[PDB]
Amino acid sequence: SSFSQHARTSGRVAVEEVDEEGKFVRLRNKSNEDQSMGNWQIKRQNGDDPLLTYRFPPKFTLKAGQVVTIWAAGAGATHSPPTDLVWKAQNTWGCGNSLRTALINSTGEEVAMRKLVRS
Amino acid sequence: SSFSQHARTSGRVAVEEVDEEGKFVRLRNKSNEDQSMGNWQIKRQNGDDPLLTYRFPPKFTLKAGQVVTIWAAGAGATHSPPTDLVWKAQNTWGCGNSLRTALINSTGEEVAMRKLVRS
Amino acid sequence: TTSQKHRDFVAEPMGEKPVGSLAGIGEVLGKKLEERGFDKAYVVLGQFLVLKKDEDLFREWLKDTCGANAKQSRDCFGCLREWCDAFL
Amino acid sequence: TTSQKHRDFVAEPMGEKPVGSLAGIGEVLGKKLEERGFDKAYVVLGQFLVLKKDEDLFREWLKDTCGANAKQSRDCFGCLREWCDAFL
Amino acid sequence: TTSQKHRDFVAEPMGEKPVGSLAGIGEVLGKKLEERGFDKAYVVLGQFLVLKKDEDLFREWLKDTCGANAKQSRDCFGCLREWCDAFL
Amino acid sequence: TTSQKHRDFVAEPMGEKPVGSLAGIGEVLGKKLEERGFDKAYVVLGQFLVLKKDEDLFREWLKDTCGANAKQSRDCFGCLREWCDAFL
Known part of the structure; x- marks a missing residue:
């Protein structure tokens, strides 16, 4: 796939899938309990590109075993909570050989991260 | 006043005032927290007249207790963001015996409403 | 014209007001209906x-x-009908 | 978990939507309920x-x-309960 | 400021839209461009x-x-320039 | 299969890369292409x-x-074809 994926998780939510073209960001709650992700921050790093910061609404909770996918403006997807959300303020999550998607909670702590590395 | 006022609001911003001549629509962030109204839509119904939809900027914030007054094109006022906006795209907000305005958020959901009903 | 309590009730959605909050519903009839089961x-x-x-x-x-x-x-019917015309 | 028709019914006040507009209600059941009197x-x-x-x-x-x-x-119970939680 | 046809053209990639879908291109202009060889x-x-x-x-x-x-x-130059800025 | 320059060109949008940045295009080839009119x-x-x-x-x-x-x-045809398949 030419993009190595590094998965690390210390909480309940893991970064399930990252789009190489930056169309969407997919996270998974692999525990057996619902995770409240109110005002959690998603920071996307594309190599040396400036950070794109996405902020969730003040009250948001992902049910256990459910999938929420954050789509970009250029993707053309339709938001449908609690499973589908679209970030119209950003045309695309970006591209590059070093794509890093870090999930930041409301306390500014990194609990999940997945990095796409291409030789 | 012959125009019975019927208001409904479930969020931090409520319909502060409605102009009977359709010059402006006035709202207030009646909470104690600054409210971000980015991309929020305003849907105004004037009896049987077609709905007029005004959309907030992608990142617009109404602070706590502040007054936002969206003026029509025929209002003649000058926009002063984030306090005064003039909807030059709409000559008048309209008139009629059934003036109901529904505020639509960034997620396309109604949280505040005021309806003026005349005999 | 209209009772003021009626205007207050029809101004806003009923929410979770007791049946007594309904216009024309005093303590006697309200208690009666609450005991009947219509407690809200x-x-x-x-x-x-x-x-x-x-x-x-x-x-x-x-x-x-x-x-x-x-x-x-x-009066109670008028209040309910007006609220329905307003919010329903 | 929920259908888009369910969300559309919930996302807005019910107004005067037909009984068929309820979540999980198709033509057959909605028609039956209208026969019963639940036409809306x-x-x-x-x-x-x-x-x-x-x-x-x-x-x-x-x-x-x-x-x-x-x-x-x-589906119908969930839709009605969510609508009540939102608007009632 | 911006024509609606121009907004529709720029909102999405041009893909395989005909020359008539270009902003500032009428039926006569589209037919002429198609005949000249610039049919898309x-x-x-x-x-x-x-x-x-x-x-x-x-x-x-x-x-x-x-x-x-x-x-x-x-109008046509502005449409193409904005398409190039948005996607190209 | 492909040179490193091909991978570098394909992995990112071309933007304003010079004609020499194309895979399989040397300094002399790029200069000739610029002279002919293909300067980018x-x-x-x-x-x-x-x-x-x-x-x-x-x-x-x-x-x-x-x-x-x-x-x-x-090499140049393959680079352009892969770029088109990746971005266009």
């Missing part, structure tokens, strides 16, 4: 919706379920 | 209020009133 | 890109190809 | 698109324009 306004309105908003049937049933006179039943 | 979503919601939001009683009543299965009854 | 929007854009995105050169080429005046040439 | 990589890509992505046509054009051989023409 929204159940009573659902009955009104179930009765398909008919004035005669709703007023007669209200009298038979608590004892509202023609005046009280008329 | 508001009548069903009023019944639900009279039912005082009991899941089992509401679903049993729906099955006895239009032959709805656990799927359709669950 | 992307070929016209490539010709615009061949002219190194120059406003004057592209507008003069459009005028000599189909007969556009100042307004039509300006 | 996106100009060569537009020429490739005009040829409707034909391999033989593009290779013959490159050979007749800058004197590129079969290997250089094949």
Whole structure:
């Protein structure tokens, strides 16, 4: 796939899938309990590109075993909570050989991260 | 006043005032927290007249207790963001015996409403 | 014209107000209906919706379920109908 | 978990949507309920209020009133409960 | 400021839209461009890109190809420029 | 299979890369292409698109324009084709 994926998780939510073209960001709650992700921050790093910061609404909770996918403006997807959300303020999550998607909670702590590395 | 006022609001911003001549629509962030109204839509119904939809900027914030007054094109006022906006795209907000305005958020959901009903 | 309590109730959605908050519903009739099981306004309105908003049937049933006179039943029906026209 | 028709019904006030607009209600069951008298979503919601939001009683009543299965009854009960939580 | 046809064209990638879907291209202009060989929007854009995105050169080429005046040439050049900015 | 320059060109949008930045295009080939009029990589890509992505046509054009051989023409065609498949 030419993009190595590094998965690390210390909480309940893991970064399930990252789009190489930056169309969407997919996270998974692999525990057996619902995770409240109110005002959690998603920071996307594309190599040396400036950070794109996405902020969730003040009250948001992902049910256990459910999938929420954050789509970009250029993707053309339709938001449908609690499973589908679209970030119209950003045309695309970006591209590059070093794509890093870090999930930041409301306390500014990194609990999940997945990095796409291409030789 | 012959125009019975019927208001409904479930969020931090409520319909502060409605102009009977359709010059402006006035709202207030009646909470104690600054409210971000980015991309929020305003849907105004004037009896049987077609709905007029005004959309907030992608990142617009109404602070706590502040007054936002969206003026029509025929209002003649000058926009002063984030306090005064003039909807030059709409000559008048309209008139009629059934003036109901529904505020639509960034997620396309109604949280505040005021309806003026005349005999 | 209209009772002020009626105006207050029709101004805003019923929410979770007690049946006593309904216009024309005092402590006597309110307590009667609460003991009847209609302990809240929204159940009573659902009955009104179930009765398909008919004035005669709703007023007669209200009298038979608590004892509202023609005046009280008329006022309660008017308040419910106006609220439905406003929020329903 | 929820259908888009369910969300559309929930996302807006019910107004005067037909009984068929309810989640999990197709042509057959909606027509049956209209035959029973529940010709609109508001009548069903009023019944639900009279039912005082009991899941089992509401679903049993729906099955006895239009032959709805656990799927359709669950969908309609969820839609009505969410609409109540949002607007009531 | 921006024409609705221009907004529709720029909102999505041009893909395989005909020359008539271009902003500032009417039926007569579209037919002329199709007859000349620029029968599709992307070929016209490539010709615009061949002219190194120059406003004057592209507008003069459009005028000599189909007969556009100042307004039509300006609208077409603006549409292609905004499409290039958005996607190219 | 492909040179490092090909990977570098494909992995990112071309933007404003010079004609020499194309895979299989040397300093002499790039200078000749600039002299002929294809002074940028996106100009060569537009020429490739005009040829409707034909391999033989593009290779013959490159050979007749800058004197590129079969290997250089094949490398440039592959680079442009992969860029189109990745972004266009």
